[PDB]
């Protein structure tokens with residue numbers, strides 16, 4: 001009846017950097033009391049995501065995300081299997097997900113807060129529902145469709161920052177699926193650069209820690225940049241914007257280089273860069289995937305189809321054990337992941 005759970009131990013501060021120690025794992029007893037409409041689930045996988053950085057602050061800065069509470073269990077995207085149900089629409093063995101899954105090994109939840117998933121959409125890789133066939137992938141798809149202005153055969157050049165992460169590795173491929181002739185990725189390591197061009201189909205890759213970014217954009221985007229799928233903001237984006245074309249579009253996915261600072265989101269561009277934006281009529285609007293829930297079902301089917309068609313390559317990085325949730329979040333925030341960071345909590349499904 002003993003389970004492990006992760007609680008928020010301390011807050012780093014809006015200007016601080018997150019560390020594994022901000023999280024603490026403890027044991028609690030799960031009273032075997034399952035009531036009408038509740039189910040008991042065994043957690044299989046949990047996600048860690050950049051937005052969780054905002055939940056670590058007392059104030060998140062937006063109505064759509066609530067702050068985590070000190071000493072209370074943390075929660076986020078999760079996938080699990082139902083071990084017992086007293087909910088009339090859920091059965092033992094069903095696989096389910098929630099965007100508010102407690103970081104705990106076994107949980108008793110209200111069946112109405114869960115969504116039953118279909119394994120065949122992901123060829124049995126349930127963790128994909130937390131990534132490419134889930135919110136990150138929907139964010140890339142919907143962001144490109146809504147903000148990218150790409151048409152088949154316009155021969156536009158797309159640059160993707162955070163290119164080897166969950167949203168960015170998916171965004172680059174979709175840019176090719178939908179019409180961009182050239183897709184260039186910017187990422188933090190040599191190893192990621194290699195994967196971008198050798199496996200994910202990117203035309204070129206730029207390592208921002210070791211290359212002269214401006215020099216490499218000029219060499220790999222000889223015609224300028226028409227669409228920038230921005231995951232990072234900061235200096236990298238100032239550089240990309242510098243080479244963006246008239247009437248180009250920034251899909252403002254996120255600005256992770258700024259998440260450990262108290263600047264409101266999204267940060268403004270500096271005077272000189274905003275001047276370029278205004279002179280060249282570059283569009284930079286906010287994009288929040290939660291504003292498009294009505295596009296979710298068909299987005300998931302589209303992402304699933306591309307995957308089943310052999311076109312979309314889905315990458316993930318796995319860390320094991322609930323005791324490593326904190327380290328996994330810290331690792332993903334600092335570049336340890338290729339693709340979607342996932343934490344495997346259990347494989348027990350019988």
Ligand SMILES: NC(=O)C1=CN([C@@H]2O[C@H](COP(=O)(O)OP(=O)(O)OC[C@H]3O[C@@H](n4cnc5c(N)ncnc54)[C@H](OP(=O)(O)O)[C@@H]3O)[C@@H](O)[C@H]2O)C=CC1
Pocket residue numbers: 049050051135136139162163164165166167168186187188189231232236252253254255256257258287288289290332333334335336337339340341
């Ligand atoms: N608009 C929306 O609704 C949504 C937005 N997002 C946003 O998309 C972005 C990517 O999210 P996601 O794909 O889940 O996570 P990723 O898998 O991309 O993981 C984060 C990556 O960010 C990179 N990074 C971290 N710090 C910096 C830094 N200081 N400068 C440059 N790159 C950095 C790291 O890779 P590297 O080694 O290359 O530095 C790291 O692996 C985030 O900004 C997130 O907020 C996600 C979902 C929805």
Ligand SMILES: NC(=O)c1cccnc1
Pocket residue numbers: 050051064065253254288290
């Ligand atoms: N900005 C983000 O990364 C984000 C992700 C999911 C929900 N809200 C915000």
